[PDB]
């Protein structure tokens, strides 16, 4: 018999992004080919199967720095980190291959699906 | 020129609630008349003007325990904590006064508005 507030999830995510932009309560640095990205472990886990596995590990959960595979493109990661905090994906002809490869590595199934569909349309 | 995934914010919140239910990466205990509630500081800040003010304070941001005002009802708090993580509010005739008072204290403007409207309908 609950009532539901339609915009609540969107409003929560908007505030989480405001905390990220002001670097408030960020608890991890993600290192991608020397580029560094500050984020909230909980948001990363909520969006990515790879971060979920990393931060539920009894040893890795305590790390303040996570280094990604050297093949990961920093721009692809940045676009995906923006998507995690906003639901908006900046998908372009020039970045789609790097975005799909990063989403496959991060285990972000819905992003992988839209990239596959956009690539299939261009062939 | 971004694309947007409609269900992303809802999916993020659902995963944050799954982390709460398994007590994963919770970083604060909220004490309400001896009852204790574990939560994520970021989610509390994203939902409440009071928690936002508390955890942006240079001294309070580092506290692992927050004690609420003794007038706060633990059931009212529990209903609101569930709303923060799910967008669902368990509003009932028997709890509406405690829920409205707790939402006013927590500075959760949308909850206060729906309680005021539901109370006005009953008079």
């Amino acid at each position: 018999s609950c009532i539901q507030f339609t915009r609540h999830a969107s409003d929560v995510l908007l505030n989480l992004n405001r905390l990220r932009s002001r670097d408030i309560l960020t608890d991890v640095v993600i290192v991608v080919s020397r580029e560094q990205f500050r984020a909230h472990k909980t948001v990363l886990m909520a969006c990515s199967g790879l971060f979920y596995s990393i931060f539920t590990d009894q040893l890795k959960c305590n790390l303040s720095v996570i280094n990604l595979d050297p093949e990961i493109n920093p721009e692809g990661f940045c676009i995906l980190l923006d998507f995690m905090y906003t639901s908006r994906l900046n998908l372009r002809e020039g970045n789609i291959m790097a975005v799909m490869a990063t989403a496959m590595y991060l285990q972000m199934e819905h992003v992988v699906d839209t990239c596959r569909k956009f690539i299939k349309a261009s062939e | 020129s971004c694309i947007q995934f409609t269900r992303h914010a809802s999916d993020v919140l659902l995963n944050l609630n799954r982390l709460r239910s398994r007590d994963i990466l919770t970083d604060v205990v909220i004490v309400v008349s001896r009852e204790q509630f574990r939560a994520h500081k970021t989610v509390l800040m994203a939902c409440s003007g009071l928690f936002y003010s508390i955890f942006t304070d240079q001294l309070k941001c580092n506290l692992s325990v927050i004690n609420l005002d003794p007038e706060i009802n633990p059931e009212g708090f529990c209903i609101l904590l569930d709303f923060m993580y799910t967008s669902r509010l368990n509003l009932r005739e028997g709890n509406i006064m405690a829920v409205m008072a707790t939402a006013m204290y927590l500075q959760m403007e949308h909850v206060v508005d729906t309680c005021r409207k539901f109370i006005k309908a009953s008079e």
């Binding site: 609950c2 009532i3 539901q4 507030f5 339609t6 | 669902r88 509010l89 729906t114």
Partner: peptide, 4 residues
């Protein structure tokens, strides 16, 4: 607010 809605009935979910």
């Amino acid at each position: 607010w809605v009935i979910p």
